[PDB]
Design a binder for this molecule. Structure first.
Ligand code: FES
Ligand SMILES: [K+]
Ligand SMILES: [Mg+2]
Ligand SMILES: [Zn+2]
Lengths: 40, 75, 43, 161, 43, 99, 177, 100, 38, 162
């Protein structure tokens, strides 16, 4: 749902496509050290 | 038509592919034009240079941006 | 009491099929996509 | 007594839904500022109890709180006992106030911490394929890796406005 | 004329007892949505 | 074979149950499932149906706030459609641009 | 809500009594509302493997209204099982024979085709002519609004509304209307 | 005076946006049942030489009447009250798992 | 009455009228002209 | 309007006609250029059978229909109003306008069946004993096909056959 609206606004139709919700790191260490990059 | 699709490389659906706007490629596309969606490749920021060949993103609008920060615009 | 002789979708007499609004809309959408493909191949 | 475009009141003269008059933008902005100020004051004073958070992790959304256990069907390449921070928070909520992200909340605004407590494999899963009258029968057994995370603290900080 | 607690039940007496228990929990601070125990290390 | 093939139906059944529960909550709050899902997507709120059902069951006030947000977005969209397009965008109709 | 486990469960899984007035209302819409309430699809805690159904009491089933010519066109058919025992009656005849049959059949048709449908029908209550037993009236909880708005007759409109509605044409003074 | 939903059944919902526009703030304090919208609790309900000797006097109805009484009492059907067999009784698990 | 698909007036005395959901060509001078729509 | 009075005075019947007050169209129509009252008042495609305040202005006191030439309406609006008036009569929305009954004739008791959107006469149609298959289903008509052009706020168009 909302794929056409996302396309009109300029985003990917699937929210799991390109964007901060997918490409940002999932987790990181509590001490602040960045996590290794995701394989996907 | 199956063989032309295989030659074009569109074996997987919903996967963008780049081709050259030349008469031969256009003739190949004219046979499978009822199975494909064709868009022009828009380059608002130019060709990806050697340095920024890993921060490129193809948006749904057909634009290949060379900077991808994953951050909101401050404006 | 309403029977279709033989198989429904093959033969001389068949069960009638009717076009739906969503089917028409889908066909129109695909026609628009192919027209845009024609325009982009025009150049 | 009848301006141009007038239609006498009939069954279909007017729409079957009541008209909606949205608030003036400036007054609504002032009201929003007041609401944000009071919610931030509540956060500063600590007038909240248990917090719940809807976060994004392992390609799915988890609604968690403190002392909760989540089983992720994937190995995170971490040793047991390590503490990590879940950086993809979409919703935070309390008894009185709820904050939503578009599509994610601020890291300074919300911080969610988990601890890896167990690394195991799932119970055996059977994949059997059988085709009738074709002498086609195959069987496979699989065991997917799994990691257990315990949510330790959902801490929010005053960062609104 | 100010509500302090509400309790559900199958009978009036059970509901009143549950309401009294809820009021006691609220007064003692042992609410269900209370602040979770802080297990963070002493820093 | 049934155990292998039921893994596809399990997800469909879960999604159907989530849709039914979300529809029940929306009807309780005076809205509908499409008018809730679409107007929540228009607000850049990417909450899946499982989380929405969990909120409806356990966070009635949060779900009511979400329904109010969806109704406000729907009213803003109706106002924009009725207008000629010269009107400024609504407060909740703005889209946070990413890059 | 700081409730104990048993009171919380009892409150969550509880039966509610709804009242629906069938005074000049579509039997199909009444049946849809009653079916939703009986199945429990109106509850966020709904599930098939549970008893989320609620009691529904429908009044004024004798005064239902059918759109169009359904009273004469709609046919209810049945078979007694014996040879020559196939009986078809019109909606009007069925309504006269049993004033609570049309709504009951509509609800039965709209309910799921499983073993829970009989329990749902048992939980359903139908009463004509605004008469409800004292127990059923006392255990009621909520009254659902009528689906179809009842139109007003010409005599129901007030003189204020009559004056508000403007005259549209000027008849000749010599006509014999 | 615009309200997306009425504020008289569950909670007073107030919606706001932060200055940057990246955060939506929802303030929802619960509503309280007013005093005027409540009913009082119905607490209110001889020369006997002999004591009030009350004994349980209820004869056991047969299967049919008993099941009919139970079905009428609980608004159910007779099949639920009808018994089952040893196969199902032994198949039933006596130690089901408990979550919380 | 005679069942017909296309009702026609055999004489000027015949008149058409719709009754019971069906058309009828009635006549009085020549009753044989009476026709019923099929 | 005009009224006719018959008086048998002294074995001499006298027939007389008198002129009574007549209503006039409300001043300042929104659309003076319209050729019919409906289009002058912008009621085209904006009325239904339940609009008794509109239907009663074009009907006789006994429930009949006024001539199109007298009313000034066009053929389409005349037919639409006639269908709406028939539906209103069948739904009992005009209790004051009833058929004239000869003296001494009292109608027998009849069952009461509430109805609305009645297209055909109740005593003309036959029961649908055989509905037929799905591809050849015999549908029950609801409403009037002439009102298909009315404004439809809902996305789903009016279903004229159930
Ligand atoms: S109402 Fe305009 S032509 Fe008749
Ligand atoms: K055939
Ligand atoms: Mg066959
Ligand atoms: Zn003749």
């Amino acid at each position: 749902a909302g794929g056409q609206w996302r396309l009109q606004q300029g985003l990917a139709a699937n929210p799991s496509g390109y964007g901060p919700l997918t490409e940002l790191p999932d987790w990181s260490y509590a001490d602040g050290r960045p996590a290794p990059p995701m394989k996907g | 038509e199956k063989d032309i699709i295989k030659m074009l490389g569109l074996e997987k659906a919903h996967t963008p592919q780049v081709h050259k706007n030349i008469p031969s490629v256009n003739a190949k596309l004219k046979v499978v034009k009822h199975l494909i969606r064709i868009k022009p490749l828009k380059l608002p920021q130019g060709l990806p240079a050697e340095e920024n060949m890993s921060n490129t993103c193809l948006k749904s609008t057909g634009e290949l941006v060379v900077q991808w920060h994953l951050k909101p615009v401050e404006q | 009491r309403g029977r279709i002789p033989g198989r429904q979708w093959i033969g001389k007499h068949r069960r009638p099929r009717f076009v739906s609004l969503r089917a028409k809309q889908n066909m129109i959408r695909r026609l628009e996509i192919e027209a845009e493909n024609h325009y982009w191949l025009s150049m | 007594s009848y301006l141009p475009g007038y239609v006498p009141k009939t069954s279909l003269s007017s729409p079957p839904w009541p008209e909606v008059v949205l608030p003036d933008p400036v007054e609504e902005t002032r009201h929003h500022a007041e609401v944000v100020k009071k919610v931030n004051e509540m956060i500063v004073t600590g007038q909240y109890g248990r917090l719940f958070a809807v976060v994004h992790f392992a390609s799915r959304q988890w609604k968690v709180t403190s002392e909760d256990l989540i089983l992720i069907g994937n190995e995170l390449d971490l040793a047991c006992g390590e503490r990590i921070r879940l950086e993809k928070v979409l919703l935070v909520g309390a008894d009185n106030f709820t904050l939503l992200g578009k599509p994610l909340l601020g890291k300074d605004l919300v911080r969610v911490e988990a601890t890896v407590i167990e690394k195991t494999e799932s119970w055996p899963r059977i994949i059997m394929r059988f085709r009738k009258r074709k002498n086609f029968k195959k069987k496979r057994i699989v065991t997917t890796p799994q990691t257990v995370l315990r949510i330790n603290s959902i801490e929010i900080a005053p960062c609104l406005l | 004329k100010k509500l302090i607690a509400e309790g559900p039940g199958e009978t009036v007496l059970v509901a009143e007892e549950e309401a009294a228990r809820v009021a006691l929990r609220k007064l003692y601070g042992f609410t269900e949505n209370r602040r979770p125990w802080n297990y963070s290390k002493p820093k | 074979v049934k155990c292998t093939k039921a893994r596809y139906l399990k997800k469909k059944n879960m999604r159907t149950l989530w849709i039914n529960r979300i529809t029940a909550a929306s009807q309780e709050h005076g809205l509908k499932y499409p008018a809730l899902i679409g107007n929540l997507v228009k607000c850049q709120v990417e909450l899946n149906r499982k989380v929405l059902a969990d909120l409806a069951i356990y966070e009635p006030k949060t779900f009511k706030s979400l329904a109010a947000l969806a109704s406000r977005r729907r009213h803003e969209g109706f106002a924009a459609a009725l207008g000629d397009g010269k009107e400024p965008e609504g407060i909740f109709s703005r889209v946070v641009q990413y890059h | 809500s700081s409730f104990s486990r048993a009171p919380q469960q009892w409150a969550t899984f509880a039966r509610i009594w709804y009242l629906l007035d069938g005074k000049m209302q579509p039997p199909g819409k009444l049946a849809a509302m009653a079916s939703i309430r009986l199945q429990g699809l109106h509850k966020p805690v709904y599930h098939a493997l549970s008893d989320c159904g609620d009691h529904v009491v429908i009044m004024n089933t004798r005064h239902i209204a059918f759109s169009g010519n359904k009273w004469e066109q709609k046919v209810y058919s049945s078979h007694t099982g014996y040879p020559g025992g196939f009986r078809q009656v019109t909606a009007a005849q069925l309504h006269l024979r049993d004033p609570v049959a049309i709504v009951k059949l509509a609800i039965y048709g709209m309910l799921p085709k499983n073993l829970h449908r009989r329990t749902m029908m048992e939980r359903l209550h139908l009463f004509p002519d605004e008469y409800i037993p004292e127990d059923i009236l006392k255990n009621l909880v909520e009254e659902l609004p009528q689906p179809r708005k009842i139109p007003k007759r010409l005599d129901e409109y007030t003189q204020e509304e009559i004056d508000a509605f403007p005259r549209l044409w000027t008849p000749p003074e010599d006509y014999r209307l | 005076t615009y309200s997306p939903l009425p504020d008289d059944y569950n909670c007073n919902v107030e919606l706001a946006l932060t200055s940057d526009g990246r955060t939506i703030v929802c303030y929802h304090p619960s509503v309280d049942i007013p005093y005027e919208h409540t009913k009082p609790i119905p607490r209110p309900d001889h020369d006997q030489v002999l004591k009030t000797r009350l004994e349980e006097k209820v004869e056991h109805l047969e299967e049919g009447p008993m099941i009919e009484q139970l079905s009428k009492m609980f608004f159910t059907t007779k099949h639920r009250w009808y018994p089952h067999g040893r196969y199902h009784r032994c198949r039933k698990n006596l130690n089901p798992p408990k979550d919380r | 009455f005679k069942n017909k698909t296309v009702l026609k007036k055999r004489c000027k005395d015949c008149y058409l009228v719709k009754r019971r959901g069906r058309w009828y060509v009635y006549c009085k001078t020549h009753p044989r002209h009476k026709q019923r729509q099929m | 309007f005009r009224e006719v009075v018959e008086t048998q005075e002294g074995k001499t019947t006298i027939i007389e006609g008198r002129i009574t007050a007549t209503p006039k169209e409300s001043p300042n129509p929104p659309n003076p250029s319209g050729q019919c009252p409906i289009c002058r008042w912008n009621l085209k495609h904006k009325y239904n059978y339940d609009d008794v305040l509109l239907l009663s202005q074009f009907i006789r006191p006994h429930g009949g229909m006024l001539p199109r030439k007298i009313t000034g309406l066009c053929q389409e609006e005349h037919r639409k109003i006639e269908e709406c008036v028939k539906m209103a009569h069948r739904a009992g929305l005009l209790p004051n306008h009833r058929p004239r009954l000869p003296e001494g004739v009292v109608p027998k008791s009849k069952p009461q069946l509430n109805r609305y959107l009645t297209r055909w006469a109740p005593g003309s149609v036959k029961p649908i004993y055989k509905k037929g298959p799905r591809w050849n289903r015999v549908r029950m008509p609801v409403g009037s096909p002439l009102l298909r052009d009315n404004v439809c706020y809902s996305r789903t168009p009016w279903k004229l056959y159930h």
